[PDB]
Amino acid sequence: NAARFVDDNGESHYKALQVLVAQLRDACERNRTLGAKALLDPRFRLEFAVSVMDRQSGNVIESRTGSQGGSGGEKEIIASYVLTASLSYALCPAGSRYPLFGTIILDEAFSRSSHAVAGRII
Amino acid sequence: ESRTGSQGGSGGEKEIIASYVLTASLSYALCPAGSRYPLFGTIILDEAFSRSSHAVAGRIIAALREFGLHAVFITPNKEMRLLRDHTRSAIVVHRRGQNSNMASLSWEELERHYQRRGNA
Amino acid sequence: DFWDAFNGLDREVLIQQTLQLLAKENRPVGLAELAELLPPAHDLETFAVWIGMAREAGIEVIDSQREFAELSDGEGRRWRFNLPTTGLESQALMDIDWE
């Protein structure tokens, strides 16, 4: 951006663009490094975190800010619930709270959670 | 079959062979130099069998027994039948509030018989 | 194996029968006493639930005092479970919510 304002017949602008494209190619060559993925993948530039709150008390009661820190069952519960919410939102036509395509297929959804927590997912 | 002919149904034989090979590798690693038996013969495996069927799981348990490995299996109250058939103690772990705790339990087969007053 | 996995301990029915039994006796019952009164068809599978009972309602369970229970399975082989000592009570159990 700074070089775009220089009056040198597109020399500084060319150099800065060269640096940027070199960065882009470096990322492309190592197309699975965390840095490259963050640089060139929309869903890698931002983190993700879940927070369980109180229905009436709005203060966060338990905030997993990534914070893996969880047993297999807890992670399975969180993932199943989040996927269910995502599917519900996706299948719901815009402006409607009831999906029109109401069938969803799960394949060995639950394997790390006890029978008591699986019922909650269902 | 120079190459594994087939499985026992969706990687059955493949899973059995992989588990057996890894058990043999663990036994060899734990077997001291020029030793037939591993000095450290206890193995801990969390989530004992979450992706393995009963028919295969019995096979892996038998394999662990054969190579002289005493294993403790961790499961979330699942696959109780084979664990009970192939073990003799259970550490029920339960967490309440912010604290967890344990409670041991054990059982043993009385010599008695398979069944009395009937076919033997 | 499909058939064996088909039939298993349905813990909701077990919970219902157990809490009804505790209400009927309305006395602190040990694990072996419960096994005698209630014949488990799955051996330890049931016991854990009962233990999950005692520690879910705060009923402390003692491991130093070891009670015992002799049970015969379907094929007739008899086994001696060395259960711990518990104080299951109906009031506390019915107090705590069941999933």
Next chain:
Amino acid sequence: KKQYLARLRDFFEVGENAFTLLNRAAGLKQLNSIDEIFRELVLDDHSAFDRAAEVANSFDG
């Protein structure tokens, strides 16, 4: 199949992303921390690893 999929989208009033997520929902077994569930299950790729190559070639010219 493109026309048939467009007809399905019109009938069920959902974009292709909905059905792609429905398909990905059958592979939920291999899951990990919320980060991986979000970056590999929902919100399909839409990455720009291929456009970068075209930009690089144009810059080479």
Next chain:
Amino acid sequence: MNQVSGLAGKESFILTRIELFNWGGFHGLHQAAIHQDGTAVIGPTGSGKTTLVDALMTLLCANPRYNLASTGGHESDRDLISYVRGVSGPGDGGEGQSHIARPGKTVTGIAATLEREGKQVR
């Protein structure tokens, strides 16, 4: 069938007891007895099974990978400090320290006994 099971102890060492003190969510003193014929650790999700195994693994391996079963061979979820302090969950996002159960001066003890033809090593 029971004749083969006697091989344990007669051949080499097998673990038989685990002692825990202020480890993870295990407040106070806890003791677990391991049968020579094999043992099972069972209990609903959100329990001490992973914590109990983590203590033993810390005892043996120089560099333990905690919560390997849930992490699936990826970066270790937790560490020694977290287990010692008894951290339960990420712990909200407003400090609070309610997740940590041993924030101040505290001590944790972890012990494991192995038997071999009567000879015991702790």
Next chain:
Amino acid sequence: MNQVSGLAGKESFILTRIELFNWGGFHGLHQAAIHQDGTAVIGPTGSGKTTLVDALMTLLCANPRYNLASTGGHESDRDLISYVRGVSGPGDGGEGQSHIARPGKTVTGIAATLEREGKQVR
């Protein structure tokens, strides 16, 4: 419990049938019904379950990921060609070059029915 059961099929389309003809290992014509209160597909491992899921996903998606249940993380082993031809790669023992069930001229049809308040969409 039952009262909520009636909500499904009222404001949404719910799958209520699947038909297959020479699909995967389902030689000939097979029909499977689905209940409006959820359904479970059960059987010995490796009989047909993932084949059913893949048939439905083919009916639904443009580039379905076949066997996402087990091959998740890497490229799927199966493809549409194999399902139409009914190869049996996994199942071997006398495998005569993959046991192409239908090598010659063949036709395979897959149909899925969805219902909502008496309105059918196949």
